[PDB]
Design an enzyme around this catalytic site. Structure first.
Site, PDB file in Angstrom:
ATOM      1  N   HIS A  42       0.852  -1.225   0.000  1.00  0.00           N
ATOM      2  CA  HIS A  42       0.000   0.000   0.000  1.00  0.00           C
ATOM      3  C   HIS A  42       0.875   1.259   0.000  1.00  0.00           C
ATOM      4  O   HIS A  42       0.313   2.369   0.082  1.00  0.00           O
ATOM      5  CB  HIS A  42      -1.067  -0.024   1.118  1.00  0.00           C
ATOM      6  CG  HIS A  42      -0.600   0.203   2.516  1.00  0.00           C
ATOM      7  ND1 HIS A  42       0.040   1.364   2.921  1.00  0.00           N
ATOM      8  CD2 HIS A  42      -0.754  -0.543   3.631  1.00  0.00           C
ATOM      9  CE1 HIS A  42       0.293   1.299   4.213  1.00  0.00           C
ATOM     10  NE2 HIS A  42      -0.182   0.141   4.669  1.00  0.00           N
TER      11      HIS A  42
ATOM     12  N   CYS B 112       3.163   1.428   9.967  1.00  0.00           N
ATOM     13  CA  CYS B 112       3.077   0.349   8.935  1.00  0.00           C
ATOM     14  C   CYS B 112       4.484  -0.115   8.528  1.00  0.00           C
ATOM     15  O   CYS B 112       5.370   0.736   8.423  1.00  0.00           O
ATOM     16  CB  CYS B 112       2.328   0.775   7.678  1.00  0.00           C
ATOM     17  SG  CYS B 112       0.804   1.696   7.994  1.00  0.00           S
TER      18      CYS B 112
ATOM     19  N   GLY C 197       2.324   5.999  10.296  1.00  0.00           N
ATOM     20  CA  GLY C 197       3.725   5.713   9.930  1.00  0.00           C
ATOM     21  C   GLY C 197       4.251   4.425  10.552  1.00  0.00           C
ATOM     22  O   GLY C 197       5.362   4.019  10.169  1.00  0.00           O
TER      23      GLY C 197
HETATM   24  C1  LIG Z   1       1.355   3.200   7.606  1.00  0.00           C
HETATM   25  N1  LIG Z   1       2.457   3.739   7.883  1.00  0.00           N
HETATM   26  C2  LIG Z   1       0.259   4.204   7.168  1.00  0.00           C
HETATM   27  C3  LIG Z   1      -0.701   4.425   8.359  1.00  0.00           C
HETATM   28  O1  LIG Z   1      -0.213   4.783   9.386  1.00  0.00           O
HETATM   29  N2  LIG Z   1      -2.169   4.150   8.208  1.00  0.00           N
HETATM   30  C4  LIG Z   1      -2.637   3.702   6.872  1.00  0.00           C
HETATM   31  C5  LIG Z   1      -2.836   4.705   5.925  1.00  0.00           C
HETATM   32  C6  LIG Z   1      -3.265   4.368   4.634  1.00  0.00           C
HETATM   33  C7  LIG Z   1      -3.500   3.037   4.297  1.00  0.00           C
HETATM   34  C8  LIG Z   1      -3.947   2.708   2.837  1.00  0.00           C
HETATM   35  C9  LIG Z   1      -4.046   3.721   1.872  1.00  0.00           C
HETATM   36  C10 LIG Z   1      -4.429   3.417   0.563  1.00  0.00           C
HETATM   37  C11 LIG Z   1      -4.687   2.112   0.192  1.00  0.00           C
HETATM   38  C12 LIG Z   1      -4.568   1.096   1.132  1.00  0.00           C
HETATM   39  C13 LIG Z   1      -4.197   1.390   2.446  1.00  0.00           C
HETATM   40  C14 LIG Z   1      -3.285   2.022   5.267  1.00  0.00           C
HETATM   41  C15 LIG Z   1      -2.847   2.358   6.559  1.00  0.00           C
HETATM   42  C16 LIG Z   1      -3.173   4.329   9.295  1.00  0.00           C
HETATM   43  C17 LIG Z   1      -4.511   3.624   9.001  1.00  0.00           C
HETATM   44  O2  LIG Z   1      -4.480   2.427   8.851  1.00  0.00           O
HETATM   45  N3  LIG Z   1      -5.802   4.354   8.953  1.00  0.00           N
HETATM   46  C18 LIG Z   1      -6.995   3.549   8.679  1.00  0.00           C
HETATM   47  C19 LIG Z   1      -8.243   4.142   9.305  1.00  0.00           C
HETATM   48  C20 LIG Z   1      -7.079   3.366   7.157  1.00  0.00           C
HETATM   49  C21 LIG Z   1      -7.453   4.397   6.328  1.00  0.00           C
HETATM   50  C22 LIG Z   1      -7.520   4.200   4.955  1.00  0.00           C
HETATM   51  C23 LIG Z   1      -7.203   2.970   4.406  1.00  0.00           C
HETATM   52  C24 LIG Z   1      -6.813   1.934   5.229  1.00  0.00           C
HETATM   53  C25 LIG Z   1      -6.750   2.132   6.606  1.00  0.00           C
HETATM   54  C26 LIG Z   1      -2.755   3.874  10.715  1.00  0.00           C
HETATM   55  C27 LIG Z   1      -3.151   4.604  11.843  1.00  0.00           C
HETATM   56  C28 LIG Z   1      -2.755   4.104  13.099  1.00  0.00           C
HETATM   57  C29 LIG Z   1      -2.013   2.913  13.148  1.00  0.00           C
HETATM   58  N4  LIG Z   1      -1.665   2.226  12.049  1.00  0.00           N
HETATM   59  C30 LIG Z   1      -2.027   2.675  10.850  1.00  0.00           C
END
Ligand SMILES: *C(=N)CC(=O)N(c1ccc(-c2ccccc2)cc1)[C@@H](C(=O)N[C@@H](C)c1ccccc1)c1cccnc1
Ligand SMILES: *C(=N)CC(=O)N(c1ccc(-c2ccccc2)cc1)[C@@H](C(=O)N[C@@H](C)c1ccccc1)c1cccnc1
Lengths: 301, 301
Positions: free
Chosen positions: A41, A145, A143
C-alpha cells in the site's frame, strides 16, 4: 518471583529496520539478505485508496522510483515484485546484520513481540497476541506500517507479522511475511469489521497457573468439573472451547503446581459465574488471555 | 490508535550484558568501556549472608578469582574495587559495542525499561516504575541479579537501576550504577520491609488522558474541583499529593484533549469515590499509575 507482559530482546531485529518512500508515502521495511519487505500500500495515493489495482499501480513504477533508507545511508533497487500484499525490493547490498531468521504463519492465540517503528527508527517493543478474530490490540500511530512481530527461538528470529492498517474499531490487521493477511482483511479503504472477539481459554488458565505460582491462590475452589460441563459455560461467556490438546499443553504447569487442569477450569467456571468481587489476580481486576502456556513457563522458569 | 506497556529497544544494551562468577555464585554484569559492573553480593557465600563484611570478604579475593564471560569469550581482570554496593572489575578489553551512556539516579514515579538476564544472556524486556516506597514490581527469577534498567535519550542509554534482591513481599530492590540502593534496603539476608506503597497521582492522570485520546471517555464528569479539595481525597485513598509542577507537566496532554487538569482530577475523585461499576479504561478494570506523562506523550505522539 513477579510476572509481567515481557517481550523478546529486540537487538537482532532493530538492525533490519529501514525506511521506504514513494512521493508523500513513507513507511518502515525489513531488510533480510539482498531483499527489503514492506506493505504494498506504499505505492497507493489518497486518490486510489477506495479500490486500488496494485498490478496496474505497480506497472507505473520502476526500480529507481523507491527510496530505501537505512540509517543515513541509501540502497540501490535492482529488482522489485509483489508477493500477495508485500513488496520484495531486491537491493545491491545484503544486510550485514541479517540474523538467522524464518518466516512463520502464527495461529490465533499465539503471542509475539512487536517492534513499533516510525520512519525506519525502532521506537518501542511490546508483547501482542493474535486474537481469534485475526486482529491485534496493538499500539501503532500513523507511519507504524511495516513494523514487524517476531519470536526468538535459540538464535533464530521467527518473523510472523507485518503491520498494514488500523480498523475503524481501533484494532490492527496485517500479514505474514509471505504477504497473506491474518483474517479476511484487504489492503483497501472499505468497510471491514472484526468478527466476535472470543477469549483464549488456554491462555486465561496459563495466567491463573502463573498466579498460583507467584502466591495469588485465593480464587482456588474446593470443587472440580468436566471438560463438557466447563465448555458449556465457556460458550456462554464467549470463550475458545478447551480441547484435550489444550489440557495436554498445560501439563508442565499442572505438574509444577500439583493441580489438575480440570480443578483450575472449575475455579474459572466460578470466577466467570461469580465475577471477582473487587479482588485481584497478579494485580489485574480481570482475566488475562494474552499469555500462552509457553510464555508463562519461560517467565516462571 | 492503541496503548500498551511499551519498552525502549534493547539492542544497544543487549551487547553490554556479560556473565560474572565466584565459586557456586554466577550473576549478570554490565561491561562499559574497560569496566564490568555487578552487585557486590557475588562474593558472599550462603555461610556469610546474614551479616557480611564486604571489605573483609573482598580482601580474601584477587583479580584472577572472578570469571568474566561475554558470549563464549573470557575477559582478564586487571583492577577491582567496591563502589558502595557494586563491583567495578577493570578488564584488558573495552567493549567494542559500548554505546554513548550516562548513569542517572531516577526519582520515585519515573519509569524505565528492564532487560531481564540469566547467565549473562538477555532473556526479555519490560517497562517498570520506581514505586514511591523505592521498590519495583518486576519479573525476576533466581540469577536475574545484575539485570539493568535504562531509558534511551537521543542515541544515549541512561542506566538508572541494577537489580540486587527480592523482598519477602515478592517485590524487588536494587541500586543506581554508583552502587546506592533506592530506598533504605541493604544487601544482607535480614528482615527488611517495603513501606506503604502509595499510588502515583500524576501517572494515573496521564493514563486517563491517554484513555480520552484513544476514545475511552465515559468516566469524564460534568463537575470540576480544587487542588486542595482533590488532594484531601488523594490522601484518603493513599495517593501521591498532586503539585502545581505535576499540573504543569500534564500541560501537553491538557492542550491536546482541550481538557483542564482539574476537570480530569474531578473525574478521578469520582472513580476513587464511586469505583468503576464493572466498566473498563484502556481494557483495564483498575487505575494504572505506571505511565509517566512523557511515556503517554511518546506513545500518543
Ligand atoms: C502506515 N504507515 C500508514 C498508516 O499509518 N495508516 C494507513 C494509511 C493508509 C492506508 C492505505 C491507503 C491506501 C490504500 C490502502 C491502504 C493504510 C494504513 C493508518 C490507518 O491504517 N488508517 C486507517 C483508518 C485506514 C485508512 C484508509 C485505508 C486503510 C486504513 C494507521 C493509523 C494508526 C495505526 N496504524 C495505521
Ligand atoms: C541474583 N542472581 C541472586 C538471586 O537470584 N537472589 C539473591 C540471592 C542471594 C542474595 C544475597 C546473598 C548473600 C548476601 C547478600 C545477598 C541476594 C539475592 C534471589 C533473592 O533475592 N532471594 C531473597 C529472598 C534473598 C535471600 C537472601 C538474601 C537476600 C535476598 C532472587 C529471587 C528472585 C528474583 N531476584 C532475586
Amino acid at each position: 518471583s513477579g510476572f509481567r507482559k515481557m517481550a523478546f530482546p529486540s537487538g537482532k531485529v532493530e538492525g533490519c529496520m529501514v525506511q521506504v518512500t514513494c512521493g508523500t508515502t513513507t513507511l518502515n521495511g525489513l531488510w533480510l539478505d539482498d531483499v527489503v519487505y514492506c506493505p504494498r500500500h506504499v505505492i497507493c495515493t489518497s486518490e486510489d485508496m477506495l479500490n486500488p489495482n496494485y498490478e496496474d499501480l505497480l506497472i507505473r513504477k520502476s526500480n529507481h522510483n523507491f527510496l530505501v533508507q537505512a540509517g543515513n545511508v541509501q540502497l540501490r533497487v535492482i529488482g522489485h515484485s509483489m508477493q500477495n500484499c508485500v513488496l520484495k525490493l531486491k537491493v545491491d547490498t545484503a544486510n550485514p546484520k541479517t540474523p538467522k531468521y524464518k518466516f512463520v504463519r502464527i495461529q490465533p492465540g499465539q503471542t509475539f513481540s512487536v517492534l513499533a517503528c516510525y520512519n525506519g527508527s525502532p521506537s518501542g517493543v511490546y508483547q501482542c497476541a493474535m486474537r481469534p478474530n485475526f486482529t491485534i490490540k496493538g499500539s501503532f500511530l500513523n507511519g507504524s506500517c511495516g513494523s514487524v512481530g517476531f519470536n526468538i527461538d535459540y538464535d533464530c528470529v521467527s518473523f510472523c507479522y507485518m503491520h498494514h492498517m488500523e480498523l475503524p474499531t481501533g484494532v490492527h490487521a496485517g500479514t505474514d511475511l509471505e504477504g497473506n493477511f491474518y483474517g479476511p482483511f484487504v489492503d483497501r479503504q472499505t468497510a471491514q469489521a472484526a468478527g466476535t472477539d472470543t477469549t483464549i481459554t488456554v491462555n486465561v488458565l496459563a495466567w491463573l497457573y502463573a498466579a498460583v505460582i507467584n502466591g495469588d491462590r485465593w480464587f482456588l475452589n474446593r470443587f472440580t468439573t468436566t471438560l463438557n460441563d466447563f465448555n458449556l459455560v465457556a460458550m456462554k461467556y464467549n470463550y475458545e472451547p478447551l480441547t484435550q490438546d489444550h489440557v495436554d499443553i498445560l501439563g508442565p504447569l499442572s505438574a509444577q503446581t500439583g493441580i489438575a487442569v480440570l480443578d483450575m477450569c472449575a475455579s474459572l467456571k466460578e470466577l466467570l459465574q461469580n465475577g471477582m468481587n473487587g479482588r485481584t489476580i497478579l494485580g489485574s481486576a480481570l482475566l488475562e488471555d494474552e499469555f500462552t502456556p509457553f510464555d508463562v513457563v519461560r517467565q516462571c522458569s
